[PDB]
Design a protein around this nucleic acid. Structure first.
Lengths: 239, 86
RNA sequence: CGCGACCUCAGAUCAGACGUGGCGACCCGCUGAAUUUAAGCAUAUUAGUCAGCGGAGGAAAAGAAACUAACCAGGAUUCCCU
RNA sequence: AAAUACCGGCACGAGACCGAUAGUCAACAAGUACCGUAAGGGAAAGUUGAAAAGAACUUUGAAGAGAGAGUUCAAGAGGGCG
RNA sequence: GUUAGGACCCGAAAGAUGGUGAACUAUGCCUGGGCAGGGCGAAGCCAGAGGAAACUCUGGUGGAGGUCCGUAGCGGUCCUGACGUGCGAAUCGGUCGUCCGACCUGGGUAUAGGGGCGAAAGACUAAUCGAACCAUCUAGUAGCUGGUUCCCUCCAAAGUUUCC
RNA sequence: GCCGCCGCAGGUGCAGAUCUUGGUGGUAGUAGCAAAUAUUCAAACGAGAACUUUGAAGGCCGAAGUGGAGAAGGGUUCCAUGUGAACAGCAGUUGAACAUGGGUCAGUCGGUCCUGAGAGAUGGGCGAGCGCCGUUCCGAAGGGACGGGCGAUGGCCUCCGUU
RNA sequence: GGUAACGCGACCGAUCCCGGAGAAGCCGGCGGGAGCCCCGGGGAGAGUUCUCUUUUCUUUGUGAAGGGCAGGGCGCCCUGGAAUGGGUUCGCCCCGAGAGAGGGGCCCGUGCCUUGGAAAGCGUCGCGGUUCCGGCGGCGUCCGGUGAGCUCUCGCUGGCCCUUGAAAAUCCGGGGGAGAGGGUGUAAAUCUCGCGCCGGGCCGUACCCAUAUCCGCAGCAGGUCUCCAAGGUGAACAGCCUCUGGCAUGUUGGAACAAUGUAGGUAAGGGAAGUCGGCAAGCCGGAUCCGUAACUUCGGGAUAAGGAUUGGCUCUAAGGGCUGGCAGCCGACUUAGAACUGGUGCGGACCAGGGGAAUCCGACUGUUUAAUUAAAACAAAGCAUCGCGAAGGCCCGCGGCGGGUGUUGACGCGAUGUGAUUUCUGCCCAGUGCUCUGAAUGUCAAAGUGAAGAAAUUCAAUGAAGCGCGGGUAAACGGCGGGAGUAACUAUGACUCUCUUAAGGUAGCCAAAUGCCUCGUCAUCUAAUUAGUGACGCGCAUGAAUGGAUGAACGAGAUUCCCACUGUCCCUACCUACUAUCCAGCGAAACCACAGCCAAGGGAACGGGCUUGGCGGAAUCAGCGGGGAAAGAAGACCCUGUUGAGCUUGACU
RNA sequence: CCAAGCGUUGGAUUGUUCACCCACUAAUAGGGAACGUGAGCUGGGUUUAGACCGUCGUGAGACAGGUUAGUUUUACCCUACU
RNA sequence: CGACUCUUAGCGGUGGAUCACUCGGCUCGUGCGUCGAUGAAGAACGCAGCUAGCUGCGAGAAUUAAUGUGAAUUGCAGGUUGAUCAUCGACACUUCGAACGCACUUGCGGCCCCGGGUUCCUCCCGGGGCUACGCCUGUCUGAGCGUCGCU
């Protein structure tokens, strides 16, 4: 997967999905923009959303591509900055917004344009606060909770296109078309189903592995294959 | 099927005329010459094929500036003057 | 705010002069094998050789000692005999 | 600077060598006919006679092929012809 | 007479540099073209009747899906049939598998040899693949095969001994 | 054009190497010119008619064509005048052979002109080296315009292109 | 100009800004308009006439560009407010967010009229210059009617997606109002109105497009991308025949009609008795009307299985539109029933499933060894582990602020494990893997730090990770015992002890696609069965995501038996097509010490040639397949070689 | 004992060489002929390359342990025989 | 008797050894020691009265001048005031190629000056001259909260 025949299929896809910049508006007060269409993008079973903000130094109309928060609809108003009202699809920094509220398309560095929580059905909740240091705790999707920098922001709600793991894909084709609008990756051939020279696991009379399928973190390539650095193994009971 | 049926799927060309060596060996998709590497600033030539070099050096073609340096050489590169009249 | 000196740095179809590429038999600077010898083979051998890249000239390169000596001392460099 | 090196280039002079399956791949429209998509691979093939004097006229045939005339010291040298 | 040398001539399976190929096929991308006639009848809807309520029966309408029969197209089961100095360095014939979907094909494009591509057989990479092709190093090395050109005259062996 | 005697010198003597190159036999006038239905009668050109040319009969393809026109690729094979050697696996009057002589005309039908997957210069950076990486990323990357004003053209510097 | 949707011939003006167009998937249903096909009548020329036939065929026309009207579609505007709900499609679907009714407006208008345009074109009939005509004259180039027919187009409406179905050159329309034009004149700027005048360079343009001009060494049964597509029977671009246009049977003629072949048929009586095996062949087949089992994941199974009906001609009955519960006229199909009738003949050729009752394997569709394996292999949805919060995991690279996953962010990228659903998935951390703890602490290199010594050198303490010590783990790789004794007939063993390991095989499931002994043994199918299926478990070596047990559908997959039907057999016959054969013309190959009748004998132990016997009579045409240890390729098996390569780890470096 | 004159058959399970059962029969004796006989057939078994188990090995791999699918070339020359 | 089969000889076919010739190679030696932006080496297309190949040459195309030589060239026809032949010093050389306005489709441009549409008047058809990178010497126009200066 390191190049050529694999690289992601980008043509019918509809934009890269970000926040705004930051500027004097977001930084000393607030700005308002309107929503002009919710809109589907491929390689990403969740919807985007165009939003005409008006540029505040020339006559113009800027136009962005947020990650659409459920409950948004068209025509509606989006008011944002360091003051703006905490309701839904209204953006303002973690510094400001209270504990308990849910967020999406959250930032990690102050000003980086949103890197966390934009896949379908993902949050990044706010827990606690410490205003000498200017730091904040945020429970992310994997159980853990990042210390974060208190001036770094997130649109309010929960991400659109919710509940996609539900339905059984049935037919093998429905896979193909899922994985024909992403990258060369599918009908996946097992490692024991390769000769001596084509995968280390496969070879001989039966179709066994032979070697234990855990391996050192500190292997080289060609070998680091299987369960990597595996803390434990088996059917997971208890917790 | 590998043999003579698939020999009948031909209606296209990899190479054509180079425009330096002139040698039907200029690879379209890759766009340098197979004989000389046309885009490349100097030539291509090599010391592992010698019957390769001696199809193609300073004797071979016309020599049309050179064959009259050698002649101009041997008295003393005379320029300007003209032989005595009648 | 202006005016002037320097320093460091743009742009030109500004005025006049230079370089590229070729041939490569002999010369200079790099980089650089394995067949094969060892009655096997890893150090050794092939060999600083083959192939690769670079620069020249009518020759190149070297060159008037941080030199050889151990003598009653020879006195830049290259080349042949030893 | 010289005394050194020079199977490429420009002219030259020789040979106890080879003599057209030899000697260079090449004595001749050869790095040419032709093969390979391309890198590349790459032949075969010298000789009438002193002179063209290269056989008017006749005759069989539709035509090639023939019979007699004739040039030459010879066609028992008749245009891939000692 | 022994030896180093291309060393009496002819012969490997290998190994080593530097170079040419995706015009067949393997796969990812851009852009055009293509696919008889029949069968089965899922949701959604129209009345017609039964019951206290839920809701249920009878008749129509409708046009699904890696659904069936089956043509063009793509493929290649059995005859272990023909052909086997052939028409063909893998054809042809009757019978066969699929045929609105992970379908079937033209053009432009990316991937290069311990390297690519693989619904995975060590498959495919220009009639070559358990490591493609072209030139050189190279006349590569051989306790092993095959050959080894004129006459007469004279003498004429060995397969046993130690050490490898 | 060549040979004997005394002396020199060496790329010096063939039956063979599934040896190299050239030429010729037996087999042999033998294997063979068998896939997709089929021909026959008259004439006229001629030194030569089972096959060409005209006319009449009987047939096949059967619009998913043995029909009519294109793109790749071929490169003149297109079309008339002749020729009978060779070739077209019997024959030739025939031929896509041979020899001579003609033939491809556009604002409106294409390429050019724009981008697609993708190819790739400069700034930078890597590099012993020819060179490689990268394509918006360490860049002073725009050489143009309607007007405000100075002073210079052209045609009666009147009015405007031209700096 | 109009209430207004919007209309009229023009209808000034910059930088800037906003949007339109170029700009889109595939599949179903219905409607409009051309081409084409059909049907009744009129012209002109043909064909046929023994008899009939107002007959059978040929042919019958108008470019672009402009104006005018039909034909189609509207998510366009007005008055007006509707349950006793209404409007309406094949399906839908619409409405106090304004329906029915009435009246208007905009876009396409490839159809008919118009100028073009009859002056040309086509059909026929007749006259000139023999030539050398785009010669010249005449008639004609009509009128009606149908449609789920086929082909192209144009619109309206529905379905599908964890699949949402290109870019930009180019060109228009708007908001805004920077400005500009001249003082009622001759008027000015200004026009996206009509007329007019000058101009468009370069390269390609012939022909084949293939059972003859392209690739396959050739005029090669191979292979190579599209466009248009008439009548008849049919469900039909199927199969068979025919028009338009095409062709000379595909590098040969003539004569015979032998044995072998290659491709077609037919067979009295029996019917797999043939064979490894029903291999090959044959049987069934179209549509209408009845009728249909196990089993099931309720969807299927299912054309199950099993029957009957079907020709020809003479009738009857139903199913529509248009003009003004009735009258007139206009009309293209089907569908049901009855009768007469043939030597019991009708899907008359052509097209066109053999059926049933089980065992295993793989859920299904899909892919795969081009050129000896299409499968039980690969992939698959579903299940489960594993790493990872970007200074990041996984990965490429000789190198650089290098690149891929990524225009991404945990319902996310990467790495393995089994294989749809239902029911289930027991014990073992001693062993290796992998992992988490650290000064509880034995091994520890570079570099230093210090003292001894005249230095060259040596000793002493300090001492990373990794190894030792101690936790986590089997949907991580696998592994899951031995022996004596006991019941009132005997077998039998519920019970009892005793040695051992990390436990010691828990659910289930068997002489299997897996059991040596083995053709295991009771039962079932046959006259007879190393076969097939139903139980018994002792199981050499069955056992649970290294998967265990089961199951509807499915299969060019492996296996058994019954009804059908057959030249597969008893036992072979005869016919047809093409060769073979004989003749004229053309005319190659492999192979070849020398050659070519046998016995026995010896001999490198199986002679055509030697020795002893038998014997030996030109030259040849068709066959055959005993012998030449026949040809075809320096044995592919085995062994040697101090000859190699592809694979793998605790071999060595 | 002389006698090898004339015969010594049809079926089920199995790839069989061998084995065992049904039925008929004068009888269902045994053998050679390159273990007679593939340019006479068949390829059903073994004994290539695909695939699945059941033991062994950490493994590439291995099985007189079992399975499924796997292309049978030439005659026109001499002889022989017709 | 005859065909056919084998041997030998004569003469003919078929084939191209052997011999004899050589404007060609091989080896040694000597001497000189010269490519290029002023456009190389190498390619491509053109050039004869009759001409395809080798040769030689460039729209001045089997070559033009000049110096020398002094009556040809030739395969057929026609055409001494210097034929033909060697020398090379004056003149000239299509398109590509390091290859140079931008680009490889023989395609689109910008800058000036000339003859024609003219009566520069832009657009129009012809003809000419400049329009690549890198780098050194200096000249012109400029940038900098770099370092200072004086009002």
């Amino acid at each position: 997967g390191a190049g050529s025949v694999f690289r992601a299929h980008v043509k019918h896809r509809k934009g890269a999905a970000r926040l705004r910049a930051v500027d004097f508006a977001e930084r000393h007060g607030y700005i308002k923009g309107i929503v002009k269409d919710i809109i589907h993008d491929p390689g990403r079973g969740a919807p985007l959303a165009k939003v005409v903000f008006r540029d505040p130094y020339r006559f113009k109309k800027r136009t962005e591509l947020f990650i659409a928060a459920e409950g948004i609809h068209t025509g509606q108003f989006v008011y944002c900055g360091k003051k703006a009202q905490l309701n839904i699809g209204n953006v303002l920094p973690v510094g400001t917004m209270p504990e308990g509220t849910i967020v999406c398309c959250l930032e990690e560095k102050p000003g980086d344009r949103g890197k966390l929580a934009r896949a379908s059905g993902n949050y990044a909740t706010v827990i606690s606060h410490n205003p000498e240091t200017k730091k904040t705790r945020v429970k992310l999707p994997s159980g853990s909770k990042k210390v974060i920098s208190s001036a770094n922001r997130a649109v309010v709600g929960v991400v659109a296109g919710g509940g996609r793991i539900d339905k059984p894909i049935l037919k093998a084709g429905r896979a193909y078309h899922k994985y024909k609008a992403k990258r060369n990756c599918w009908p996946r051939v097992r490692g024991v189903a390769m000769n001596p020279v084509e995968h280390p696991f496969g070879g001989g009379n039966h179709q066994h592995i032979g070697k234990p399928s855990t391996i050192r973190r500190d292997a080289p390539a060609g070998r680091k294959v299987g369960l990597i650095a595996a803390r434990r193994t088996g059917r997971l009971r208890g917790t | 099927t590998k043999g003579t049926s698939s020999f009948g799927k031909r209606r296209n060309k990899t190479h054509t005329l180079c425009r330096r060596c002139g040698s039907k060996a200029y690879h379209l998709q890759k766009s340098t010459c197979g004989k000389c590497g046309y885009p490349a600033k100097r030539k291509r030539k090599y010391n592992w094929s010698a019957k390769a070099k001696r199809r193609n050096t300073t004797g071979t073609g016309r020599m049309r500036h050179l064959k009259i340096v050698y002649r101009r050489f041997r008295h003393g590169f005379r320029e300007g003057t003209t032989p005595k009249p009648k």
